Amino acid sequence: AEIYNKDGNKLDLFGKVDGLHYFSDDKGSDGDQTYMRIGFKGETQVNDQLTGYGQWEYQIQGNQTEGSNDSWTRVAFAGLKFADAGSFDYGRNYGVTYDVTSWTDVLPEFGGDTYGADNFMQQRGNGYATYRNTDFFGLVDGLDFALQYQGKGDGYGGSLTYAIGEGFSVGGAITTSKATVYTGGLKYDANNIYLAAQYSQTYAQNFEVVAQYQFDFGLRPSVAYLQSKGKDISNGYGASYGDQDIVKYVDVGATYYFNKNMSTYVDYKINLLDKNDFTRDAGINTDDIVALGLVYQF
Amino acid sequence: AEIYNKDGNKLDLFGKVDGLHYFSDDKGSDGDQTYMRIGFKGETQVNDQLTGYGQWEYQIQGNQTEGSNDSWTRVAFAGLKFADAGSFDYGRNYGVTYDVTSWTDVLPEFGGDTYGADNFMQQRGNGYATYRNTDFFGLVDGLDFALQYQGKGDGYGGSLTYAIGEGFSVGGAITTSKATVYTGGLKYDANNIYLAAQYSQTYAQNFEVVAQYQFDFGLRPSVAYLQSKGKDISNGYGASYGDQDIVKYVDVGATYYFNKNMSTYVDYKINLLDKNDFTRDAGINTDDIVALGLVYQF
Amino acid sequence: AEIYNKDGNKLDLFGKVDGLHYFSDDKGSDGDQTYMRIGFKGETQVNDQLTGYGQWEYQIQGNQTEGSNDSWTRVAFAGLKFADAGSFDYGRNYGVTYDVTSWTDVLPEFGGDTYGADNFMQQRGNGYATYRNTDFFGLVDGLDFALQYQGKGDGYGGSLTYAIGEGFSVGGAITTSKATVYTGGLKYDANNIYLAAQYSQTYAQNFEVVAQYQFDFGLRPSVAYLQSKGKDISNGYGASYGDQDIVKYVDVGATYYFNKNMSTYVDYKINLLDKNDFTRDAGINTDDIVALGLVYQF
């Protein structure tokens, strides 16, 4: 919801109350988790050439009872934007590994999650300097790329998207922090068909694919699969764990789209993982789980 | 302040900074409680028939100091409205007992309080799935009902309102969670003349009644009274306390009304409870306490 | 961004994402500190005479990791406004000392800092009942006075600011909670030149001086300094810490405003404190540091 436009300065104030109640035999997941979101994108044209933007967004829960306050800044960054030189912006932002990893997180509820926020660059984090450049300096249309730097431990990364034509995105991203990661994804986008898959290796090799159709009265079914395997492991100081599977599941989900402002969705995580000494001490869940929600957004 | 309305999606954002310096002999109350609430109501017409909504207004303190943070989500939900088919909304929402109980929470400062928030659905809560139906299916003018449902522990209730005509309002509900508390009460609202009473017993009984008149220049005086009395009693694990009053007091008060957007108001709790083996440990305030401040809103 | 004006009720929503990267040899300093702030000014015209305003603005960190939350209400007060009798505003407000003390705090990033927040009335805090009078009952131009009163511990204070024609401003102020504190400052304000020096003494003496010049192509380059020397202090229940310096350093800085919504800045704090018995047992910093951020506001 754009709340202000005047003399080349525009502020969309966006956000939503998403209602949703997880079902499970798991008890760290059964319950109400209606959270909600606020955040604004800001903008200011300085000269025909640049723009000084700014962008924030925080989450805050609703399931937490009174007195208690489960809050946190999702993204919060300021930058600048020059004519066909692209843009730099430093703040709490997305790791530039997300650029490709993104295409697979699209599920109604249970997406990404083979990478985490503050998980050494693959997702969000703090202190990120970010130069991404769009339509390769105005000479190559449909080719984008970003070269990124991190705040503390110290890190770096790069990403290149490419819309090869049609809707076939192709994408790569490399990153390192002091632990590196590659990142390859290919998305199809066109005629209501969304087919995107992505995988990589780390310092430990994970995959994810997802396929949706967009029904016309407004309903986006989704079959999606993702996994992650590894190598040797270490409980804090010691404990030698062999090579097992981290998180692997098939997923059917459907979102219904009333209009922009209001969606409604059921999603069925069909879990695979087997209950063992791994998935006890680490406390990785093994139960297939299912969630319904009524989101209102603005 | 409805900040945006266009293409049948509105979004009133509302709030207030309400300053009040309590006064007391007690040190738990005596001091600055300058607090504030932001939030928004959001709408979206989907059809001739339905509109989706969503609403969130969470609290913050101006009394806590710098670094330390006292906030919590008062409400957060999203639901649908079908025309004459009532309205569903699940989430951090009000309780069904409150429908009826509310008519008594009209004091300048200290009203209701025979129930806290999260106090088993008599007020706010979490997981509160709800369907309310106004004007009874659009066949009876002014007889409205609710049947609600809670998250966990488990539960349910349901209210029936009726503006008998003129300015009267008879009111009733029951509720239950796994503790079952009922509700009876009346209100009268015609000629700046506000009269209202409510009470029920639980599983153990409490009552509240109030009277107000709205002055033409803008001064709504309120004398009001409420009390609670109890049966068998247990201090966490154990105890034998007998039957005593958990809270009973008479109230003078008078809100002044510059306009809608601004208010001043003096309220004087005239407590009756005597200092005893009850009000020492369980820590019930046994002091009469008097509040002074300025509510600015938008 | 004034977001509302209708029937003489205004509402100016502001905020800003100022992503800075602190450099130092410290480990509590060097790193990322993207903070951000929201805040609303409030307005409602009641008569020709009064217009009952209200303000608010809490902070929120963007460096704090996910799940964690670093917030605090900076100001949140409600007040009325009588034209030629002044303005009363009770709430989480600035202390009556800051009227003067302020003129020195204009440095790009670090400044003031001699007084803390909640630092016994010298700046921000809670419970402030405030009556300031502008243009002195409308009969003396170039003058303002204030006599404030705190909540709890108890206290009072006064202030007298006078822009003495041209661009010279004389500032005097006093506060006395039950330890006192005077305050004396001088600002010069005209042709692209700021010159502001101030000091005081508490129950313990401090001083701050700054001179910034406002360029024509944008860029206010700054030079500034401040020092605070005390008497006998004691660690909680003991320790005789002779006579030393809390903090003394010369500062250099430079904001570069692109326009009124975007700024870039560097701030080179040159610190002069030697590390000894004091700085080690009290967490006082011995290092000189560099600050580099990118404010965006609205």
Place of tokens 């754009």: A2
Task: Determine whether A67 is exposed, middle or buried from the number of CB atoms within 10 Å of its CB (0-12, 13-18, 19+).
Answer: exposed
Q: Is C296 on the interface with A (CB under 8 A)?
A: yes
Point out the residue among B3, B65, B295 whose CB comes nearest to the CB of C4: B3
Distance CA B87, CA B55 (A): 14
CB C295 within 8 A of CB C261: no
**Which pair of structure tokens corresponds to residue A101?**
């990893």
Distance CA A91, CA A100 (A): 20
Cβ pair B31:C151 closer than 8 A: yes
CA A63 to chain centre: 22
**Which pair of structure tokens corresponds to residue A264?**
């409604």
The experimental resolution of this structure, in angstroms, equals 3.6
Place of tokens 């909304």: B89
Q: State the residue range of the domain holding A263.
A: 1-298
List beta partners, residue C208. Answer: C198, C226
Point out the residue among B46, B73, B117 whose CB comes nearest to the CB of A262: B46
Q: Where residue C43 sits, what CATH number does that domain have?
A: 2.40.160.10
Closest CA to A8 of A57, A81, A77: A81
Interface test with A, best of C36, C72, C292 (most A CBs within 10 A): C36
**Experimental determination technique:** X-ray
Cβ pair A296:B118 closer than 8 A: no
How close, in Å, is residue C16 to chain A by CA atoms? 8
E strand or H helix at C100 = helix C98-101
Q: Where are the beta strands (DSSP E) in C84-236?
A: 86-94, 124-128, 131-134, 143-150, 155-163, 168-177, 180-181, 184-190, 193-201, 205-213, 220-229
- Classify A104 in phi/psi space as left (phi over 0), alpha (psi -120 to 50) or beta: alpha
Cβ pair C78:B296 closer than 8 A: yes
Cα of first residue to Cα of last residue in chain A, in angstroms, is 6
Cβ neighbours of residue C135 under 8 Å, at least 6 residues apart?
C141, C143, C144
Concatenated DSSP letters of A35-97: EEEEEEEE----SSS----EEEEEEEESSS-TT---EEEEEEEEEEEETTTEEEEEEEEE-TT
**Which pair of structure tokens corresponds to residue B150?**
């809670």
Number of residues written out for chain B: 298
Give me the half-sphere count of Cα atoms (radius 13 Å) on the Cβ side of residue C254: 6
E strand or H helix at A98 = helix A98-101
Distance CA A251, CA A267 (A): 8
Q: In sequence order, which ranges of chain B are alpha helices (DSSP H)?
A: 98-101, 135-139, 277-281
**Which pair of structure tokens corresponds to residue C72?**
């605090």
CA A159 to chain centre: 15
Distance CA C266, CA C26 (A): 18
Cβ pair C126:B1 closer than 8 A: no
Cβ of C108: how many Cβ atoms within 10 Å? 27
Distance CA C208, CA C227 (A): 6
Q: Is B287 on the interface with C (CB under 8 A)?
A: no
DSSP category for residue C44: -
User: C176-212 burial, b for 16+ CB within 10 Å, e for fewer?
Assistant: bbeeebbbbbbbbeeeeebbbbbbbebeeebbbbbeb
Distance CA B13, CA B5 (A): 11
Closest CA to B55 of B45, B41, B43, B72: B41
Point out the residue among A11, A50, A69 whose CB comes nearest to the CB of C1: A11
Cβ pair A118:C65 closer than 8 A: yes
**Which pair of structure tokens corresponds to residue C157?**
């204070």
Closest CA to A176 of A95, A113, A116, A105: A95
Closest CA to C290 of C112, C31, C19: C31
Q: Residue A229 phi/psi, 5° resolution?
A: -115, 170
Compute the CA torsion angle C61, C64, C68, C72 (nearest 10 deg): -30
Cβ neighbours of residue C231 under 8 Å, at least 6 residues apart?
C204, C243
Point out the residue among A1, A66, A298 whose CB comes nearest to the CB of B72: A66
Amino acid present at A145:
F
List beta partners, residue B21. Answer: B32, B292
Contacts of B217 in chain C (CB under 8 A): none
Concatenated DSSP letters of B36-78: EEEEEEEEEE-SSSEEEEEEEEEEEESSS-SS----EEEEEEE
In three-state secondary structure terms, C204 is coil
Q: What angle do CA A248, A250, A256 make, to 5 degrees?
A: 130
Q: Where are the beta strands (DSSP E) in chain C?
A: 2-6, 9-22, 31-42, 54-61, 71-82, 86-94, 124-128, 131-134, 143-150, 155-163, 168-177, 180-181, 184-190, 193-201, 205-213, 220-229, 245-259, 262-271, 289-294
User: What sign has the CA pseudo-torsion C83, C86, C88, C94?
Assistant: positive
Distance CA B127, CA A286 (A): 25
**Which pair of structure tokens corresponds to residue C31?**
């790193």
E strand or H helix at A280 = helix A278-281
Cβ pair A19:B77 closer than 8 A: yes
Name the closest residue on chain A to residue B117, using Cα atoms: A66
CB B116 within 8 A of CB B105: no
Cβ pair C54:B17 closer than 8 A: yes
Q: Residue A281 phi/psi, 5° resolution?
A: -70, -35
Give me the half-sphere count of Cα atoms (radius 13 Å) on the Cβ side of residue C148: 35
**Which pair of structure tokens corresponds to residue C290?**
């560099």
Closest CA to C36 of A133, A152, A38: A38
Point out the residue among B18, B60, B71 whose CB comes nearest to the CB of C78: B18
CB C130 within 8 A of CB C89: yes
Distance CA B47, CA A258 (A): 10
Number of residues written out for chain A: 298
Number of domains in chain C: 1
Place of tokens 């790069």: A158
List beta partners, residue A77. Answer: A55, A91
E strand or H helix at A101 = helix A98-101
Closest CA to A282 of A230, A236, A250: A236
* CA dist B120 → A64, B89, B176, C290 (Å): 15, 18, 8, 53
Closest CA to A130 of A191, A71, A55: A55
In three-state secondary structure terms, C220 is strand
CB C81 within 8 A of CB B298: no
How close, in Å, is residue A57 to chain C by CA atoms? 10
Cβ neighbours of residue C126 under 8 Å, at least 6 residues apart?
B32, B34, B62, B63, B64, B65, C91, C92, C118, C151
DSSP category for residue C23: B
Distance CA C27, CA A9 (A): 38
Closest CA to C291 of C10, C19, C20: C20
Cα of first residue to Cα of last residue in chain C, in angstroms, is 5
Q: Is C5 on the interface with A (CB under 8 A)?
A: no
Distance CA B96, CA C75 (A): 36
Distance CA C2, CA B285 (A): 43
E strand or H helix at A99 = helix A98-101
Name the closest residue on chain C to residue B19, using Cα atoms: C91
* CA dist A174 → A116, A132, A207, B45, C255 (Å): 17, 14, 16, 45, 35
CB B287 within 8 A of CB B274: no
**Which pair of structure tokens corresponds to residue B130?**
């709800």
Strands A86-94 and A71-82: antiparallel
CB A97 within 8 A of CB A175: yes
* CA dist A226 → A114, A209, A247, A288, B258 (Å): 8, 6, 8, 14, 61
Contacts of B298 in chain C (CB under 8 A): 4, 9, 11, 40, 42, 44, 54
Cβ of A236: how many Cβ atoms within 10 Å? 5
Contacts of B40 in chain C (CB under 8 A): none
Closest CA to B23 of B11, B14, B32, B34: B32
DSSP category for residue B161: E
* CA dist A190 → A81, C11, C84 (Å): 29, 44, 67
Cβ neighbours of residue B163 under 8 Å, at least 6 residues apart?
B142, B143, B169
Distance CA A22, CA A8 (A): 44
What secondary structure, in 3-state letters, does A127-168 show? EEEEEEECCHHHHCCCEEEEEEECCCCCEEEEEEEEECCCCC
User: What sign has the CA pseudo-torsion C121, C125, C128, C132?
Assistant: positive
Name the closest residue on chain B to residue A66, using Cα atoms: B72
Long-range contacts of C282-290 (CB under 8 A, 24+ apart): C282/C235, C284/C246, C284/C247, C285/C26, C285/C28, C285/C29, C287/C24, C287/C25, C287/C26, C287/C29, C288/C24, C288/C249, C289/C22, C289/C23, C289/C24, C289/C26, C289/C29, C289/C30, C290/C22, C290/C23, C290/C24, C290/C266
**Which pair of structure tokens corresponds to residue C66?**
């996910």
Cβ pair B127:A262 closer than 8 A: no
Cβ neighbours of residue B23 under 8 Å, at least 6 residues apart?
B29, B30, B289, B290, B291, B292
DSSP category for residue A278: H
Distance CA C89, CA C79 (A): 4
SS3 content of chain B, % helix, strand, coil (to 5): 5, 55, 40
Cβ pair A17:B72 closer than 8 A: no
Cβ pair C34:A91 closer than 8 A: yes
Q: Residues of A numbered 240-269 whose beta carbons fall under 8 angstroms of chain B's beta carbons: which are they?
A: 258-262
List beta partners, residue C220. Answer: C255
**Which pair of structure tokens corresponds to residue B219?**
């001064």
CB B208 within 8 A of CB B103: no
Q: Is A28 on the interface with B (CB under 8 A)?
A: no
